[PDB]
Amino acid sequence: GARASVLSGGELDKWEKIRLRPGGKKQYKLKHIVWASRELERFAVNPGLLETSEGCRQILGQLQPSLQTGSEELRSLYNTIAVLYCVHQRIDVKDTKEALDKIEEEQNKSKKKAQ
Amino acid sequence: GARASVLSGGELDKWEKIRLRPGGKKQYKLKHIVWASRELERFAVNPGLLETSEGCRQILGQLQPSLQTGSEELRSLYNTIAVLYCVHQRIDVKDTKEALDKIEEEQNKSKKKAQ
Amino acid sequence: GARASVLSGGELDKWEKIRLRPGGKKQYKLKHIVWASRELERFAVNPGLLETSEGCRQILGQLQPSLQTGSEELRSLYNTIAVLYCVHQRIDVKDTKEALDKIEEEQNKSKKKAQ
Ligand SMILES: CCCCCCCC(=O)OC[C@H](COP(=O)(O)O[C@@H]1[C@H](O)[C@H](O)[C@@H](OP(=O)(O)O)[C@H](OP(=O)(O)O)[C@H]1O)OC(=O)CCCCCCC
Numbered sequence: 001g002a003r004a005s006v007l008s009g010g011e012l013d014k015w016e017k018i019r020l021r022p023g024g025k026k027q028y029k030l031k032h033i034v035w036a037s038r039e040l041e042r043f044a045v046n047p048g049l050l051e052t053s054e055g056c057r058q059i060l061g062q063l064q065p066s067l068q069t070g071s072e073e074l075r076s077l078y079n080t081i082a083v084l085y086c087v088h089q090r091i092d093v094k095d096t097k098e099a100l101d102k103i104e105e106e107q108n109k110s111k112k113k114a115q
Numbered sequence: 116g117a118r119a120s121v122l123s124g125g126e127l128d129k130w131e132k133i134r135l136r137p138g139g140k141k142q143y144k145l146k147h148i149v150w151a152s153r154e155l156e157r158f159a160v161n162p163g164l165l166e167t168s169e170g171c172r173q174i175l176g177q178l179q180p181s182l183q184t185g186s187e188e189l190r191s192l193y194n195t196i197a198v199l200y201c202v203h204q205r206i207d208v209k210d211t212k213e214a215l216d217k218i219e220e221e222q223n224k225s226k227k228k229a230q
Numbered sequence: 231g232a233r234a235s236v237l238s239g240g241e242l243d244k245w246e247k248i249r250l251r252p253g254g255k256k257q258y259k260l261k262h263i264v265w266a267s268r269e270l271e272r273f274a275v276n277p278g279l280l281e282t283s284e285g286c287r288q289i290l291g292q293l294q295p296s297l298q299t300g301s302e303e304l305r306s307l308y309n310t311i312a313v314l315y316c317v318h319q320r321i322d323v324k325d326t327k328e329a330l331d332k333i334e335e336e337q338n339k340s341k342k343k344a345q
């Protein structure tokens with residue numbers, strides 16, 4: 001229906017704060033958390049993966065390489081899955097952009113220890 | 116409708132015998148052979164591939180790597196495609212689990228001659 | 231509805247000339263340009279990619295490796311995307327087959343400078 005699950009009380013507060021973009025006027029809302037869950041199940045991917053910091057990582061991994069080959073439907077996903085994942089880990093970005101940079105750098109560190 | 120095609124007379128006998136799980140009470144039935152064919156065509160994959168030992172291998176190959184990234188919809192597939200494939204090859208497992216081990220080991224042998 | 235967009239006036243002329251096959255009697259028509267656009271959006275891929283020589287390349291890249299693992303739905307795509315791409319680049323093949331050879335050879339050249 002429209003209840004909490006993916007994000008807890010504390011996460012919800014920050015979530016509503018985070019904005020979809022750095023230079024916008026539309027904060028994040030449950031509409032985005034559910035909008036992704038629906039598109040997820042469509043790709044044979046349960047929405048529960050978003051409720052777990054581990055499940056999200058698995059999703060971003062498939063969408064990562066499918067960022068250029070993927071379509072708009074995939075782009076939006078990476079946006080939500082990003083801001084959400086950051087919440088489950090620790091990163092408390094203000095927008096969806098900052099979340100992309102953080103996750104982008106974290107991957108660059110592993111490159112040195114996984115080349 | 117509900118006739119034979121993927122599995123012949125002899126294969127049908129063994130199929131009905133094989134169980135979906137090692138510790139269960141629900142043997143295999145045509146319902147599972149058709150249930151997969153439907154999900155197959157959905158992924159741009161003709162159900163006929165299951166009627167051929169060659170087609171199955173091609174399917175298990177894509178689902179193999181998509182076992183962790185894939186969703187529940189993919190899991191069930193690997194289960195049926197497994198028990199079925201084993202029938203077309205030679206392996207006559209009793210459950211779906213044994214089929215996974217057999218196919219798992221067969222792949223380990225090639226690793227030594229394809230590393 | 232049924233207007234021009236992907237192929238311009240000049241491209242349209244050649245398009246209608248090109249045949250789906252070398253030994254057939256069914257030339258190409260808008261029906262094929264739209265038929266693909268529909269299947270594209272289904273895979274999270276905007277149909278606009280076909281209107282751009284760059285977008286097409288990105289599509290053929292994903293379908294390339296998915297030529298054997300992919301289903302019939304993918305085959306038809308590679309057929310249209312091929313004849314179309316050739317138009318945006320320069321190749322003016324007469325059928326869909328010739329388009330496959332041209333794109334096949336072009337990739338062989340890069341192999342020598344990208345092995
Ligand atoms: C007399 C009254 C006259 C005024 C009323 C006349 C109509 C009127 O309202 O103004 C037109 C428009 C603003 O209205 P408008 O609804 O088109 O605003 C843009 C629209 O929402 C886009 O979808 C946004 O980009 P995206 O979805 O996030 O990609 C874009 O954001 P930004 O990201 O740009 O901030 C928004 O500016 O002005 C411009 O700034 C366009 C500059 C080009 C910018 C577009 C290039 C991104």
Ligand SMILES: CCCCCCCC(=O)OC[C@H](COP(=O)(O)O[C@@H]1[C@H](O)[C@H](O)[C@@H](OP(=O)(O)O)[C@H](OP(=O)(O)O)[C@H]1O)OC(=O)CCCCCCC
Binds near residue numbers: 020080
């Ligand atoms: C049962 C029916 C249920 C469906 C109807 C329920 C409501 C519904 O329509 O879906 C919600 C929404 C799409 O609708 P929605 O109008 O909110 O679409 C977004 C909105 O226009 C933003 O302003 C765009 O960013 P910007 O102005 O250019 O910055 C953003 O573009 P992209 O640039 O993201 O492509 C658009 O996706 O889904 C998502 O994809 C959000 C993922 C987070 C992405 C936002 C992070 C940028």
Ligand SMILES: CCCCCCCC(=O)OC[C@H](COP(=O)(O)O[C@@H]1[C@H](O)[C@H](O)[C@@H](OP(=O)(O)O)[C@H](OP(=O)(O)O)[C@H]1O)OC(=O)CCCCCCC
Binds near residue numbers: 138
């Ligand atoms: C007074 C009468 C009181 C009795 C009636 C009260 C209700 C009652 O019938 O008993 C409860 C239940 C058995 O009934 P219940 O329908 O829940 O049985 C389980 C259910 O079908 C699961 O979906 C099966 O796992 P999966 O889909 O294949 O994954 C699981 O199989 P196994 O694979 O476990 O054999 C089944 O046991 O007992 C337990 O054994 C649970 C232990 C935890 C096991 C679950 C962890 C897998």
Ligand SMILES: CCCCCCCC(=O)OC[C@H](COP(=O)(O)O[C@@H]1[C@H](O)[C@H](O)[C@@H](OP(=O)(O)O)[C@H](OP(=O)(O)O)[C@H]1O)OC(=O)CCCCCCC
Binds near residue numbers: 147150187191192
């Ligand atoms: C037009 C509508 C047609 C659709 C309605 C037609 C009937 C229909 O509903 O679909 C059939 C069936 C799903 O329904 P169905 O209730 O049989 O689902 C399975 C059943 O509950 C088993 O007991 C589960 O295993 P276990 O108790 O935990 O061991 C198994 O889980 P997984 O662990 O497999 O996820 C479940 O999938 O499809 C398949 O996926 C079978 C693939 C073989 C998988 C079985 C091998 C484990």
Ligand SMILES: CCCCCCCC(=O)OC[C@H](COP(=O)(O)O[C@@H]1[C@H](O)[C@H](O)[C@@H](OP(=O)(O)O)[C@H](OP(=O)(O)O)[C@H]1O)OC(=O)CCCCCCC
Binds near residue numbers: 253
């Ligand atoms: C008294 C009147 C009797 C005559 C009326 C009796 C019925 C009658 O019309 O003739 C039968 C048939 C021609 O008619 P028919 O509609 O079946 O023609 C074939 C049909 O359209 C296939 O789908 C085409 O292959 P694909 O979709 O592109 O793959 C095939 O093309 P090609 O690519 O073969 O040119 C077509 O020939 O004859 C043969 O040539 C078959 C030889 C085997 C060829 C099939 C192997 C590809």
Ligand SMILES: CCCCCCCC(=O)OC[C@H](COP(=O)(O)O[C@@H]1[C@H](O)[C@H](O)[C@@H](OP(=O)(O)O)[C@H](OP(=O)(O)O)[C@H]1O)OC(=O)CCCCCCC
Binds near residue numbers: 251261306307310
């Ligand atoms: C809203 C509903 C809209 C849908 C209804 C609108 C009309 C509609 O039905 O779809 C159009 C068409 C499929 O229908 P359509 O009857 O034209 O199908 C093709 C036709 O039979 C050819 O003769 C076949 O080649 P050949 O005789 O064996 O040589 C070709 O096979 P393949 O060998 O290609 O598999 C068939 O796909 O789509 C495409 O895939 C064309 C892609 C270009 C492929 C052609 C290049 C070979």
Ligand SMILES: *C(=O)CCCCCCCCCCCCC
Binds near residue numbers: 001002003
């Ligand atoms: C929002 O309220 C989340 C609930 C998701 C919808 C559940 C629908 C009801 C479950 C039982 C119906 C199954 C019919 C046998």
Ligand SMILES: *C(=O)CCCCCCCCCCCCC
Binds near residue numbers: 117118
């Ligand atoms: C079970 O009976 C397997 C048959 C699959 C359904 C076939 C449907 C009938 C074929 C002709 C209908 C096409 C309409 C032009």
Ligand SMILES: *C(=O)CCCCCCCCCCCCC
Binds near residue numbers: 231
């Ligand atoms: C063929 O004519 C190409 C046009 C594609 C269909 C567009 C449908 C009309 C657009 C506005 C409808 C949206 C409802 C708010």
